[PDB]
């Protein structure tokens, strides 16, 4: 989907009486609608957090760990 259909789906999901579980890799799309975060981590632990992504990040900052570097960017050639 493009941004227009993405926004339409986000609005439709907001105007929903029932409940939904959405798996996605778009952080912004997930943040604009999610009320409970179910996030997977290493060693098969699925951390569950009731709240949106803003308060999820705030909770991580409240109890955080000291580093910021994920990747290595290994190579292709040779």
């Amino acid at each position: 989907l493009d941004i227009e259909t993405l926004r339409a789906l986000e609005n439709a999901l907001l105007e929903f009486p029932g409940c939904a579980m959405v798996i996605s890799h778009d952080r912004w799309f997930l943040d604009r609608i999610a009320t409970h975060i179910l996030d997977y981590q290493d060693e098969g632990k699925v951390e569950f957090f009731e709240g949106n992504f803003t308060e999820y990040e705030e909770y991580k900052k409240r109890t955080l760990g000291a580093d910021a570097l994920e990747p290595k960017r290994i190579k292709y050639k040779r």
Binding site: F49, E50, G51, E55, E58, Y59, R62, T63
Partner: peptide, 12 residues
Amino acid sequence: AENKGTAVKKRE
């Protein structure tokens, strides 16, 4: 006790 609930969310 672990900074997670709806109460600790309200204080935030």
